[PDB]
Design a protein around this nucleic acid. Structure first.
Ligand SMILES: [Ca+2]
Ligand SMILES: [Ca+2]
Ligand SMILES: [Ca+2]
Ligand SMILES: [Ca+2]
Ligand SMILES: [Ca+2]
Ligand SMILES: [Ca+2]
Ligand SMILES: [Ca+2]
Ligand SMILES: [Ca+2]
Ligand SMILES: [Ca+2]
Ligand SMILES: [Ca+2]
Ligand SMILES: [Ca+2]
Ligand SMILES: [Ca+2]
Ligand SMILES: [Ca+2]
Ligand SMILES: [Ca+2]
Lengths: 74, 80, 98, 99, 80
DNA sequence: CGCTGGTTTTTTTTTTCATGTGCCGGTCTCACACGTGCCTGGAGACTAGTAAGCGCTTCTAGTGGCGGTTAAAACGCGGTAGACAGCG
DNA sequence: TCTACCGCGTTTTAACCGCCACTAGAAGCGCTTACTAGTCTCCAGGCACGTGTGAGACCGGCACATGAAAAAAAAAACCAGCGGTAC
């Protein structure tokens, strides 16, 4: 139903509290709860995070790859 | 409450501590009781069998000692 | 409000009980358990007090040993906490089980 | 375009194959050399019934196959699929084969 | 000397396969050789000891069978 | 704009390929099976010597139950460290 | 990330103990006699040595399991283009 897994992440990380970062499994849980979602959503949010990490728009504060904590444009 | 419950959590904890265990899952205490029971069943069964063969109604230390040797768990300091 | 970190007392306990040799199961509850199990094989059986003590020595010995082996199985799985599957492995490898 | 089996698929095939069979899996001569060599250390100019050497081999292969079973379990118990020396050592320690 | 190398990687692999092993660390092949050697040392030592006691110079199957029984590794089919 | 529809991508599926394993019908070889004659070990019957069963005695131990202490268990509390699961 | 294990403090439990009295039953003595050994004989059933026959072990081949890589279909993640809105 709900689009822009990009807009989905941004809306879940907005809602998520001012942190050093925001970790996938805490965002994956928010998006699955708040919007009409599928199963492969867990595996699409994983591809959604990596394209936002890629575009400089999101950046990761701790960890590496797509297990760790991610921050926005400052 | 079967006498098996008389083998208290804290008692098992103690045995494990002598075994050099630091942290113990909750499930272990029942699991241990189960094992301990099988052990005693097997040992006593044999012990009693020795008793019956000696046409006695009193289980002797030796009856146990002989039983433990059979089970390959030789015990020093109770005779034999 | 003095509090010891989880594990610090555990260690203390270990050192204490390894140092000592006294039986760690309460004598009466054990003795009841023995007689109870014996009943299943033959009724109205008497026990030398020494025979019951022998059984306890052998039992505690056995378990202490089993825990050592269990502990190793836990660590071998990069755990510090023993679990039923640790015991089961130890008994399987010992040829006690299956 | 060549044909390749994924790593492990042949391993499985091998397992099924050798479990099915009973034939000794060590080459008979190299073993027999190893036996005589070890025997020298206990007594020199020793002869062996051929049956005695075969008995030793049966017992050895049996022993190891068994040890591997136990080792395999120790590997899996550590959430691994690959046996390693520490798997064997654990198995032997628990068996009371070594301290 | 050192026929221990005659126990080839592929042979060990075979034994492990019968043991239901799927994947095998490189280090295992030397480790296995070490174990196999200790096994044979212990069995043969005893076997030869039986031979010497029988004032023989030829190790019999029975010499091995008796040795394996002693070691708790009873073997059927060589005159047990 | 918010929609919405169709299409781009990610999943699952079907498929095709290939390969290897299992099976039958026909074939050779050798270990099974049996059969001989001979030997040894079994059974036999007898005699005597002994071990053990049975009853009697003794004596011991082991059992049951006494007061009440004080230690241990047991409960629930609250807070971390570790189980664990995923990623790369 | 999540909780289930530890380590803490109060409420409940019961084991331990140092003692006694009473008995079943362990243990030990003397009798009997029933059993087992240990002898001389007789004998056949089981051993080795040696025969020949059928089973299984082998072969090839063709049919069946399988796993792998490839073609096809489905499910779901998105661009436009649009109608509709107020400019
Ligand atoms: Ca019963
Ligand atoms: Ca009962
Ligand atoms: Ca009675
Ligand atoms: Ca009674
Ligand atoms: Ca001579
Ligand atoms: Ca056929
Ligand atoms: Ca053949
Ligand atoms: Ca958990
Ligand atoms: Ca809690
Ligand atoms: Ca006849
Ligand atoms: Ca005949
Ligand atoms: Ca024959
Ligand atoms: Ca035939
Ligand atoms: Ca748009």
């Amino acid at each position: 139903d709900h689009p822009k897994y990009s807009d989905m992440i941004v809306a879940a990380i907005q809602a998520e509290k001012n942190r050093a970062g925001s970790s996938r499994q805490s965002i994956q849980k928010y998006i699955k709860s708040h919007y009409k979602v599928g199963e492969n959503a867990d595996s699409q949010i994983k591809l959604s995070i990596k394209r936002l990490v890629t575009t400089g728009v999101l950046k990761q504060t701790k960890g590496v790859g797509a297990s760790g904590s991610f921050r926005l444009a400052k | 409450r079967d006498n098996i419950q008389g083998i208290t959590k804290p008692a098992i904890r103690r045995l494990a501590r002598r075994g050099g265990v630091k942290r113990i899952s909750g499930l272990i205490y029942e699991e241990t009781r189960g094992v301990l029971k099988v052990f005693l069943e097997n040992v006593i069964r044999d012990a009693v069998t020795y008793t019956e063969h000696a046409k006695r109604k009193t289980v002797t230390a030796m009856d146990v000692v002989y039983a433990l040797k059979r089970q390959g768990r030789t015990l020093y300091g109770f005779g034999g | 409000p003095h509090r010891y970190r989880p594990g610090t007392v555990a260690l203390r306990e270990i050192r204490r009980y390894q140092k000592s040799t006294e039986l760690l199961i309460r004598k009466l509850p054990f003795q009841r358990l023995v007689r109870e199990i014996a009943q299943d094989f033959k009724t109205d059986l008497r026990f030398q007090s020494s025979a019951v003590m022998a059984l306890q020595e052998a039992c505690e010995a056995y378990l202490v040993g089993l825990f050592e082996d269990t502990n190793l199985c836990a660590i071998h799985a990069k755990r510090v906490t023993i679990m039923p599957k640790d015991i089961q492995l130890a008994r399987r490898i010992r040829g006690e089980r299956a």
